[PDB]
């Protein structure tokens, strides 16, 4: 009893993204993919935006270099997998409100 491998896809197609438990994003949110061709290997960075927040994710290169993720779709009836190489991207979401700040100090001098 072993599952057979039907097909392998070796070129960029599918990606994987880490988020907060509850991530749902707009029905339309779009994900900008980026690519790095480092020497002979690719490092990937994802960036997206929404009406309030903006979500940015990137790869842990030292774990990327030591482990590689593969996803496949199997059919039990066709016994077949479509393999896809996918980058896992650790995503964080900042909002526009997360873009406000104070002066570089609280305006103090000597006595204070």
């Amino acid at each position: 009893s072993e599952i057979e491998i039907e097909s392998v896809q070796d070129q960029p197609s599918v990606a994987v993204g880490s988020f907060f438990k509850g991530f749902r994003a707009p029905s339309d949110t779009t994900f900008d993919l980026y690519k790095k061709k480092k020497s002979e290997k690719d490092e990937f960075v994802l960036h997206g935006e929404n009406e309030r927040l903006e979500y940015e994710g990137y790869t842990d290169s030292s774990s990327q270099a030591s482990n590689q993720y593969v996803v496949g779709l199997f059919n039990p009836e066709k016994k077949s997998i479509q393999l896809y190489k996918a980058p896992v991207l650790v995503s964080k979401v900042v909002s526009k409100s997360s873009k406000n700040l104070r002066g570089p100090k609280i305006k103090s001098k000597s006595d204070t």
């Binding site: 880490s18 842990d60 030292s62 774990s63 270099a65 030591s66 482990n67 896992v88 650790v90």
Partner: protein, 172 residues
């Protein structure tokens, strides 16, 4: 503080102790004890761990006494099953005594902490950094010398002589 603890076996001398105020305060190293003065090849250890099945902490997304945490020099790198805790500890010792994995210095201390009811919080804390106290013992499965530190020793079955090696128990 002055009480001689059994943890000191192989590290502090059970008889070299002054008598008076300092008694128990002025300990003495074993004649075979060594002190780490550097740190090495810690950078390559994550790569091998990743190969061994450690899930990267960004991907792991789990934490608890219910899971073994693999850490290197206080850099938390991942989580696995406690069973994988033991598999990693032993296979790690094999690759330690082996000579084909240069990213793995002989003097690394493999802190395995098994799961234990109200025991020490589990994990696989490796250490390669400075000031580790290290002492040689003979690793039997590869019949060659291995450097052990006091942390990992706690959970290690070291027979004191070859005739008392208990089956399935003493690894050194």
């Amino acid at each position: 503080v002055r009480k001689l603890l059994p943890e000191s076996w192989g590290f502090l001398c059970p008889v070299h102790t002054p008598d008076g105020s300092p008694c128990g305060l002025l300990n003495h190293f074993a004649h075979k004890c060594r002190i780490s003065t550097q740190q090495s090849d810690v950078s390559r250890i994550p790569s091998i761990l990743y190969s061994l099945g450690v899930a990267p902490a960004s991907h792991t997304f789990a934490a608890g006494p219910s899971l073994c945490c693999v850490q290197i020099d206080g850099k938390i790198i991942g989580w696995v099953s406690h069973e994988q805790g033991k598999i990693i500890a032993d296979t790690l010792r094999y690759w330690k005594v082996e000579g084909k994995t240069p990213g793995l210095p002989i003097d690394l201390e493999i802190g395995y902490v098994p799961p234990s009811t109200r025991g020490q919080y589990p994990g696989l804390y490796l250490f390669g950094g400075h000031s580790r106290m290290l002492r040689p013992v003979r690793y039997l499965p590869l019949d060659k010398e291995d450097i052990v530190g006091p942390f990992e020793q706690v959970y290690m079955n070291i027979a004191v002589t070859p005739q008392e090696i208990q089956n399935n128990v003493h690894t050194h």
